[PDB]
Symmetry: D4
Subunit: 163 residues, 8 copies
C-alpha cells in the first residue's frame, strides 16, 4: 500500500517522454508513489476511457497528462474522472506548442484542466503542483515540499557569472 500509486502520469506517445520525464523525476525526488504510462486519446480512446474512469477507485488522487499538437488527452481524461487533472502542453514542431497550449487550457466551464507551461518547465511544475495538492493531507510530504521550496530559494545566486 506504501508503494501504491497516488499520481498517474500519462502521455500521448514516446515522443512526449522527453518532456514528461521531468514530472516523473520530480515525483520520485519527493518520494511520491506514481505510475507512468502511454495513453493516446486518438489512437487508444477506449484505453483512455477505462484509465480515467477507474483512476479514483484504483487509488489515484491526481492525474498529470501531457500531449502535443491537437492535444486532447488532458481534456478527455478530465471528462471521465472526478479527480483533478493537470495538463502539460508538449512543444510541437511547427507551432512551438501554441496549438498544444490552446487545445489544453481553453476548456469550457464545467470540465477543468489545470494547465502548466509549454515543455519541460510545465512537466516539472505539474509534478510540483500535484505534490502541493497531496501535501494538504500528507504531513510528511508537506515537510519535504517545504524543504524543497526553501532550498530552491536559498540556492539562487546573488550575481551572475560574467565569465
Amino acid at each position: 500500500a506504501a508503494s501504491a500509486p497516488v499520481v498517474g502520469i500519462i502521455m500521448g506517445s514516446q515522443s512526449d517522454w522527453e518532456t514528461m520525464r521531468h514530472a516523473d523525476a520530480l515525483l520520485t525526488e519527493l518520494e511520491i508513489p506514481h505510475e507512468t504510462l502511454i495513453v493516446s486519446a486518438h489512437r487508444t480512446p477506449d484505453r483512455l476511457a477505462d484509465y480515467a474512469r477507474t483512476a479514483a477507485e484504483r487509488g489515484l488522487n491526481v492525474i498529470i497528462a501531457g500531449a502535443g499538437g491537437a492535444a486532447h488527452l488532458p481534456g478527455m481524461c478530465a471528462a471521465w474522472t472526478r479527480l483533478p487533472v493537470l495538463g502539460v502542453p508538449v512543444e510541437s514542431r511547427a507551432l512551438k506548442g501554441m496549438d498544444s497550449l490552446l487545445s489544453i487550457v481553453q476548456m469550457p466551464g464545467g470540465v477543468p484542466v489545470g494547465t502548466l507551461a509549454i515543455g519541460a518547465s510545465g512537466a516539472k511544475n505539474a509534478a510540483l503542483l500535484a505534490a502541493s495538492i497531496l501535501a494538504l493531507y500528507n504531513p510528511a510530504l508537506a515537510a519535504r515540499l517545504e524543504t524543497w521550496r526553501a532550498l530552491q530559494t536559498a540556492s539562487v545566486p546573488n550575481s551572475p557569472i560574467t565569465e
Copy 2:
C-alpha cells in the same frame, strides 16, 4: 430517408453556427440527423455515437465545437468514417483556439477541417455532399446545379 450524414455539436451555443450545415444538407435533400454531443460533458455519449455511426448507415460526420474543441478529433478516434470539423468562433480568441485544437491532428487520425464559423459549417455540408455525390448520381446532379447557380449568381459590379 435514413440519415447518411450526422451533424453533431458540443452545445446549444454552437447551433447558431451549425444550423448553416443543417440548412445546406436540407437544401440538397440529403437525409441527416442533427444532434448535440459534448466531448467533455457527455464523453460516453460521444464514444457510443462514433463507434456505432457506420453500423447505423452514416457515411459522413460533421462535428462542430469551440474553445478546446475536441469533439471532431475524438469522434474520428472511434470511427472509420470521414469526419469533418467546424471550428466554432470563441468569445476571446475568435476561434483560433477552436481551429488549432481541431486541425492539428497528428498522423493516423484525420479530421478534414473547414473555416472558423458559419462559412465552415456551410462548407462542411458542401464537402459532405461532394463525398456522397461520388456514389449518388442524382445528388451529384443537384450539387452540380448548386455550384453552377453559385457561380452564375455572382454580380459583375457592386451596388
Copy 3:
C-alpha cells in the same frame, strides 16, 4: 465555517469574471473568502496574504488577473499551497497577454492555469473542489452529483 479556499483578484474590474468562481464554491457549500489583492498596486498586501495563507487554514488559492497578470505567479512564489490562475479577458489582446503571463511559469513555482474568462473562473472553482474532495467525503459526493447533473442535463438535439 472557516474559509478553505481564497479567491483573490487584481481589481473590481475582474469581479465580473471571478464572480463565477465565487458562485460555484457557494453552490458546492465550500467555505471561502473573496478579496481584491493587486500584485502591482498592493504588493505588500499580496506578500502578506500569500505568506500567511497556509497558517490561516486555506487549502487552495484561486487568483484572477488581466493584462500583465502577475497575481497568480507571485502568490505562488510566497505560498506552498496550490495556486490556480484565471486569465481575465483584456480589452485589446482578449486575454492572450493574461494567459501567457500566467501559464508560462518556469519550473519550480507552479500555477495551475484555466481558460480565459468566465469559463476559467468556473473551472478554477471546480478544480479547487476536486482537490478538496480528496479528503472530504461529503464534498466528494456533492461534486459527483454536480458532475453527474452536468452530464445528464446536456440536451440530445438543438432547439
Copy 4:
C-alpha cells in the same frame, strides 16, 4: 482500369515533395491507385485550371493538394472541380506554416477545402481521409482501412522507454 488513378496528389513545387511524399506512401500502402504531380497555382495557373476542370471526367474521386506560404493551390483547385478537395499546409520557413494554414482553411462558404495539419502529419492524414472517403463505396478498401486503423491502435505501447 484497375490501375486508373482515383486520387490525385498535386503540389506547388519540388520543395513540397518532402511533405507530400507521406500522402503518396500511405495511398500506396492501402493499395489506392493515384497520380502525383506538380501544379503551381501561381506559375502554372492554366495547368491548374485544366487539371481541376477535367479531374472528374478523368476518373478522379478525390484531390489532395499541398502548398506553402500564400497557399492558393487547394482553394483554386476546389473552385474548378466538384470533387472533394483536401488541403495540406506545407510548413513555411518564417511563419512555420501559419500562413499556409490560414490561406487554405479559411475558405468562405460555397467552396470547401477539407484541411489537415501543417506538415507531414497533414499529408499522411489527407491520404487517410481520402481512403475513408473511398472506403464508403469500396468494400475491399474498407476492410484494409479497418485493419490499418486496428493495427495502429494495437501497436501503441503501454509505457514509455525510460532509456
Copy 5:
C-alpha cells in the same frame, strides 16, 4: 476615358472597404472600372479578366478579398501588370488571414500588399496613382497637390 486601373473585389461584402479605392481614383480623375470578381466562385471570370487586362489598356489592378484571399495572387498569376492587394478585414481573424494569404507570395509572382481594411484600399488607389504619375505629368501634378494638402491639413494640436 478608357479605364487605366481596374478595381476588382471578391464580393459585395468587400465593397464597404473597396469603395475607398474607388473614391480616391475618382478624386484624382483617374479613369477606372470597378467590378466584382470572385477567385473561388468565378474562377474563369478571373482568368479571363487578368489575361486580357493589358490588351484592354489597363495599367494597374487593385484587388481586394478577405479570409483565404486568393484574388490578388491569382490575378497576378495571369497578368504581367502590377497587381496591388487589399486584405479585407474578416469577421473572426480581423484580416490576419486575409493579410497572410495575400502578402506571402513566393518569389516569381508579386502582389504589392497594402494595410488591412479601408486604409489599404485608399493606399492601393494612391499607390496606383503614383505609378501612373510616372508617365502622366498632369496626374503627377494633381498627386503632388493631394499629398501637399494632406500634409498641410494635419492640425498642430488635438481638439
Copy 6:
C-alpha cells in the same frame, strides 16, 4: 543616361543585404539600371530624408526598401517621396519577420507602401513588381519581362523527383 538609375534599393544595414541582394540580382537580370545603398531610418534619419526627398529629381522612378524588426525605413521613405515605394520585410531573429511585416504593411490611409513577402521571396518580388511598373512605359523591358514570366511558367516540372 542609359546607365542612370531608375530604381533605388535601400536597406537599413549590412545584415539586410543577404535578403536584399535578391532584388539587386533580379533588376540586373532584367537589365534595369539601379543603385543599391544602406540607409538607416534610425541611425541616419537625415540621410533618409534627403534620399527620399530628392529621389524623383534624381531620376528614380521606384524605391525598394528593406528593413527588419521595428521596420520604419519603407514607411518614412514614402512619407518624403511621391514615388511608389515597395517594402520588403526582413526576417527577424525572434519574431521571424512578423514585427517587420506589420511595421511595414500597416500604413494608414494617405501614405502607401506596397509590401511583399517576408524574406528573399519578398526581395525578388519587389524587383519584379518594380519591373512591371517600369514595363508600362518601356516596351523593351516589357518584352524582357514577358519572356521572363513565360520562361518561369514553362520551366515548372510536371512531376516531383521521388529520389
Copy 7:
C-alpha cells in the same frame, strides 16, 4: 511654466488615448505641451520637433501612434532625450501592429514602450514623472503621494 514634457500623437484619432497622459501630467502639475505630429503625413514637422526638443528645454517626449506606428522610433532617431512610446489600439489588429512597430527597436536607438491603449498613455506620463522626480524634490514628493494614494485606495473586497 515652460514645458518639460512633450506629448505628441499621430492624429486626432489618437487623442482619446493620449488624453490620459495629458490628464496625469496636469494632475501632478508637470508643465507640458500636447501636440499632433504625424511621422507619415508631417515628416519634416517631426524632424524639426525632435531635433529641437532638447534646446527648447524638454526633458522627456511621450509619443503615441497606431498601426505601422513610427512616430516614437523616428522621434528617438533625432533626439538624445528619453522617448516613451504608447501603442494606440488599432481597429483590426487591436494594437499588436502598434506594439511591435514601437517596441522592437534595434540596439542603438531606444524607445521605452508602455502598454497598448489608455493604460499605456497613463503609464507613459507616470514614467515621465518618475524620471523628472530624480532631480525635482517637490515633484518627487507629489509622485510619492500619488503612488501612496493609489495603493491605499484599492478596496479589500469586490462590490
Copy 8:
C-alpha cells in the same frame, strides 16, 4: 561616492545573463556606475521586495530588469519602487520572447515599466535609455552620450558589401 551605483541591472537567472550582459557593457562604456545582480521574482520574492523598496535610498536612479517566460521581475520591481523601471524581455525557447514581451509591457495604468525589444537589442537599449535619463542632470554624461550617438550615425556605411 564616485563609484556608487546609480543604475541597477537585475535579472531572473544566470540564463538571462547572455542577454543582460549587453546592458552591463553599454553602461560601462558610457562610464555609468552600476550594480549587476540576480533577483528572481518567483524564487526570491522577498529579495526582490527588499531590493526594490530600498533602491532609492541606496542611491539608485534607474532599474533595468530582465526576465523571460512569465516575466514578472520588471513589473513587481516597479510595484515597490518609485524609480523608473525599464524592462527587457528575454527570448524564450518556445514562444521566442512573445510571452516575455506581453508579460512585461502590458502593465495596467498606475505602475509603469518602460519596455525595450526582445533580446540583446532590448538590453543594449535599456542601458541607452537609462543613460539618456541620467544625462538630463549630468552634463558630463550628456556629452559622452551625444558623442556616442553622433559616432553611431557617422559609422553607418553608404553601401553594402556585396562580397
